Amino acid sequence: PISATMVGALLGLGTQMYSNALRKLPYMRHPWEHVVGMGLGAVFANQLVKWDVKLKEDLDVMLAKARAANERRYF
Amino acid sequence: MNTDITALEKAQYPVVDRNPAFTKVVGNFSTLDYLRFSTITGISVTVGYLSGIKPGIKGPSMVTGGLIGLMGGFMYAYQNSAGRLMGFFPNDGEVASYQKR
Amino acid sequence: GSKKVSDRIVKLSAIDPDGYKQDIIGLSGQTLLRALTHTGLIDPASHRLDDIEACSAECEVQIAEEWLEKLPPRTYDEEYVLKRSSRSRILNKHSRLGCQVVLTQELQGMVVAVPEAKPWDIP
Amino acid sequence: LEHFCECYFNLSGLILCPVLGSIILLFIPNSRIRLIRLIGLCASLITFLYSLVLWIQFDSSTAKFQFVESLRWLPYENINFYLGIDGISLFFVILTTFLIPICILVGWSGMRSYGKEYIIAFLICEFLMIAVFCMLDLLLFYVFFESVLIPMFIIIGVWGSRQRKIKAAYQFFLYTLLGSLFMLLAILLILFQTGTTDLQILLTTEFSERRQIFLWIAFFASFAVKVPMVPVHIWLPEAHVEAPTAGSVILAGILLKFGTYGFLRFSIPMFPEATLCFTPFIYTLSAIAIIYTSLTTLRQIDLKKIIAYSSVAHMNLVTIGMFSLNIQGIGGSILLMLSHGLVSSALFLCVGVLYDRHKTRLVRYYGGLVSTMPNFSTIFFFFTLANMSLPGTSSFIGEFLILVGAFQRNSLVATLAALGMILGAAYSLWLYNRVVSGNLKPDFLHKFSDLNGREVFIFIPFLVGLVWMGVYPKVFLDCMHTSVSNLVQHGKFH
Amino acid sequence: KVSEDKNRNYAVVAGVVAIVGSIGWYLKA
Amino acid sequence: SPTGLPAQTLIDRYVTVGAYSLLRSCTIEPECIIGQHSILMEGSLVETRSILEAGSVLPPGRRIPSGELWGGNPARFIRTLTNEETLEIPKLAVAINHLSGDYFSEFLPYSTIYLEVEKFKKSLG
Amino acid sequence: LAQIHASENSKSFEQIEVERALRKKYARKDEDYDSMLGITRETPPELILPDNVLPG
Amino acid sequence: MDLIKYFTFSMIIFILGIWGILLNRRNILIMLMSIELMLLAVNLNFLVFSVSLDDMMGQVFALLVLTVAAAESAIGLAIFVITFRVRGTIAVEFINSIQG
Amino acid sequence: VKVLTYFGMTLAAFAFWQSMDKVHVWIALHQDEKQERMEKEAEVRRVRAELLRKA
Amino acid sequence: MFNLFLAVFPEIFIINATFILLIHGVVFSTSKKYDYPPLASNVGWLGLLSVLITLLLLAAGAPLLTIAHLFWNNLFRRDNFTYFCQIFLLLSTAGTISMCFDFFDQERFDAFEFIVLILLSTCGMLFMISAYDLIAMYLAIELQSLCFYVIAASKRKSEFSTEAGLKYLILGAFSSGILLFGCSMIYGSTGATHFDQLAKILTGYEITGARSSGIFMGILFIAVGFLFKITAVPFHMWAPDIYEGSPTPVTAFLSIAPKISIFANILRVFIYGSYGATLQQIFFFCSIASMILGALAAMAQTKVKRLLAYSSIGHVGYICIGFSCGTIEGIQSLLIGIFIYALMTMDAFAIVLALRQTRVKYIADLGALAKTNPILAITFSITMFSYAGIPPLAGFCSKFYLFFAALGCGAYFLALVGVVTSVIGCFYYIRLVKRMFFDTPRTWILYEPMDRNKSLLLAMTSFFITLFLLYPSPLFSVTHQMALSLYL
Ligand SMILES: [Fe+3]
Incomplete structure (x- = not known):
């Protein structure tokens, strides 16, 4: 389907083309950089997904402690 | 000078050594630690060389970048090794060597 | 060829801040600032557009009253710019924004005074 | 809760089509003008066909939202958004998908100077306008409605004919933004009570009469600007006149419908008690706008100003119908909304035909055109009649049904609203005669060309649609009555 | 037959070391 | 320049200089068309939205007023341009730039001649 | 004029490279930082045209 | 009444700095000196409070604020020198170009 | 200034500081009225909030 | 003993690297043998x-930064909030540096000491974030401020740069003196400078009738100093003049990093200490003044840099509305607003530095940019619509909160001010889009294309600005984490 890897690869390729266009260069100037950008974007998207999962776990632990501290009031 | 290594957040892994000595942490350097060290140092030497071409000092710039990379890579490797010995990072190999010696 | 650039030429005299008189040349229908930048009396790089929205009185010149009646009266925006760019915040009656003065044939021989350049290149 | 749909043709693909077209057109060089034109036109046409298929699978017995598909925002699933349509929004999706290819075809000849930016702006507008009409959430409706401001601003400012477009684009942006800001406040106040913005939940929640009144005022502040109601309608003549032709078509045919759509989707069903309290207030504002703006139209001298001002009077008659709160009034209000988007769009196309050739909008220059452009004169007369709500045209069906629904509630407002039959006839025929009838004036205009093959084809679906609704509105009313009936009954149990 | 610039050669070695080390770093983590 | 103005050659934006034309210290204001095989001499000025026919000759210090079509040797007034004709000038410049895009696309940043030079050098020792 | 054009067109590859580097080196300036260092950068003679071709 | 008297000594120096700002709109060097008077008054506050509370933290901070005051004065006068060197004068009418 | 002017300004400042001493003694002497007035204003607020919650 | 310093490993490394670069620069810039090479770009890359x-050292050592917390307690305090704030500060500094190489090479700004002072101020802001005592807070603030005074005057022969530095030193030293006077009052009244001690002394009482006026005024003066630092009205007039007069990379750096660090200080001092209502009313009234004044003054500007300065003043007003409400969602929204404003400002200053190669100064200089560089005009229009808060761009997020708190804390005058100032801001932002797209000037300025660093940074920030509302979960989660970690 629409995995993180594909979204990241597309974003990285688009980032290399956008950069070339902002510099008035042909869209495909230095194609090996387009390959590098695809790889880096894929890696970044997958790592962002993993980091988001980890963040949620940490937040749940923090929210559990906050609710325990708040429930201590009614003791 | 009174000291206290106790951290705010407790180590989540078996504590092999609470306050490992400097030479003990250096001797605990693993293959991955040396890989991190070498990668940081090599990148730093390369950046020093490439940024030194225009002013004409690629060699001295290479030495400067390599020194920055050597200090940073050694500090990173020490960080990881000491964290493993202290139980802050996953330390399977440290525990396997500890339970035997 | 029945149509020369000399038909549009306007003769003019500018006095530089060191008090020396020079004979400058400009085309009718173009601003006094363009004629002034032809010789480098005013740095063209300091005033590249002829718009009041791109002017901090880098084009300001002083003109005697005899030539001031041969010009349209200063606009509110022009006086605002001149007054605010003054170091003393005082509107000089003989000051005109060179970017807002269009040369015409009735301004032949007009004499203009060019003050010291203000700083214009913002870091 | 993944409320995904089992149908093959769904709303997500329709929303994605013009977006894919725009993305592809991003990367095509401006030297490949033929390819840019073809790709844009084909993307818009496939979107039109897709929407027709959505019509085909519509179920006209249910009052539930159809083709409902859920789209998830956070893996926490607390905030999750839904898309769906009913008999009230289906034809507006269809109208958007139909008008966009017309907008591309109108600028076909100038496409070598417009560039891919023109097509991309219109394709982006299409995506947002389809989405706005397909939203089951107050917050997403808000966010998608403001998104259209950016491309509409660009369209008006870049491709407008003269420098009054600067002021026009400013006024359009600022008025619309102000209105959308009051809607945001109400959305956040609703969210404070209910903890949600899901429309279906809101339709099942009870509001206090005090807070119903207040939230209704907050919705009115945005919708009355969109409609537009007096005295916040003065942005319309500037924006609709200074826009390019296709821009005027989009502005009058689709964007104007968003305020009345917002009255039918949010204010009227969600706050039934406040709606009853403000019914004399809406009746008064609409009646004033109909009488006053019709008389201003009479005294306009610009071709595009007469058509723009006519749009205000037609839209305020729509509000009388929807606030009559019965089958005829709300049914007629939706039909007039659809009819206006065809009639006023066709009328803006007639004026643009004249402007592209002679480059003037002043009525005084024209006249006598029947002797040089009989084809345009005949097509112009037909849409002139449709603008007068002549029986047999699409606009008469909606107009009379609204008057029926208004008469059953208040005979005075139906009487004042029926005065537009006299006034609307006066300015439409005076416009037609001063442009088409009489003698030519060779000192102003001496060289003439009638419509070409592209302009005649452009007018064909407008003639067919106007006739088709005017003689057999049953194909539309049948698919609407179940949703209309439940909108009227919302909030009462007897 | 031989590349003479020594500083260039050392830079090349550093770049290769960085690439192989990054690959090993991924492979062992 | 004989006119006394600065003597740089300025070819402004959206200007089409027809093939085989000679320009020496002339100013062409934006959106003009210079006909093929034309000659613009020192200090001459072509004002904006003007067109010159092919084979025109503009002597030193002469001027082509805006919105006009000129031609001949020496150039003479012919007719005033209509609005549409003047709207078509930047379209001509844009179309020529679109054509030049095809020629720009045929050249990679570097050539491969240096390889031919290398083997020529090797085949000589 | 022929002298400067002939001098340029007959330069070898090595001299072309030397002058390209020099031209890039002296294209802009920082006379403020130079005065801080107490040095005066001088345009190399191979980038200076003879006075007989200068406009004055 | 000892503590109030030392405190009012420091307070008068602080107020004198404020007045010196208020009273020298043509004299930017005196403004810099007024700021130094305020800093001195604050240092005195810290030392007096350290004595009054029998606490050393006020003395540690007084020494560090001394270092900061010296650094501020050195940099401030450097900027004054380059401002004068560029303009040839210290008059306030030559340092008002940036505005609006 | 003249040296005598600096001396006279010092004398005036000495007088000012002795006046400040008198002000400080006056403030110290009226701590009890401040305390008694504060007793009222806080207790009024108590009797007040207590009465306002009886309903 | 050595393992205790694991908590200061990032700072030790950055300080030592700064010393190495200082030595390398001064040794080889004076070298006759290498012909006194300009080293600004070389030292910049290093x-x-x-x-x-x-x-890398800071982010990969998250648990180790809390080692020896009792030994280090009287010096600083490292936690999750500080961890994320410092990561964001380092990212800002890296982006700003990467945006300076074209300026070094083309204007020939050859001073490598520029990079050294930027790094020393980065050290100072890193220490600011972990500050947990009034003394340490003041010291770190002064270090950062002194570095800024020197870099604001870096173009030492320019009238504008010298004027900017002079106003910065006088107004900055004045504000610092006021803040130091507040610290002295608090210390005299409570006998305490540590944030924990101040917390214990001040909680439970606020204004309990017999309020310590010493504590109250220490708080007021410290608040005045903080408000000067964040350029809140009426302590703001130094900002537009210094932003204009400073070299543009300095303006870009001063726009982002100091705000991150000072807001970290403000949170840990006020939200954590306990005087209460007055402190938040201070920030409420200053937020309102900032929004109104920033909107009007920006509407009056004709130069790009001044417009950006006034826009930043208005946006700090919007952010401080979050601190005013004093709830978990208030802190979260403040952090989200700071992050989005920082990325947007980085986008805007990347574009400004790109156009500074052809000396952009006025808004009218951007005429016909949609013809000469259409993709740059689109990228810049996206930034302006994001600044204006038009959904679904990232700028909407911050605007959405403003009204959420206004209807949450029950404040409709704030809501009305927000509606009017948002409309004004929209007008003066879309004026730039009109200039680049709708105008037909007689004279055009052709701009040189930007370098690779700025194009890559611009592409990334523009993709973030257009697409953040599609996947906003990580920022929401991390800011909620930081807001919670302020207390637990
Ligand atoms: Fe001017």
């Missing part, structure tokens, strides 16, 4: 590398 290695 310093960017140093910042990235510092970031």
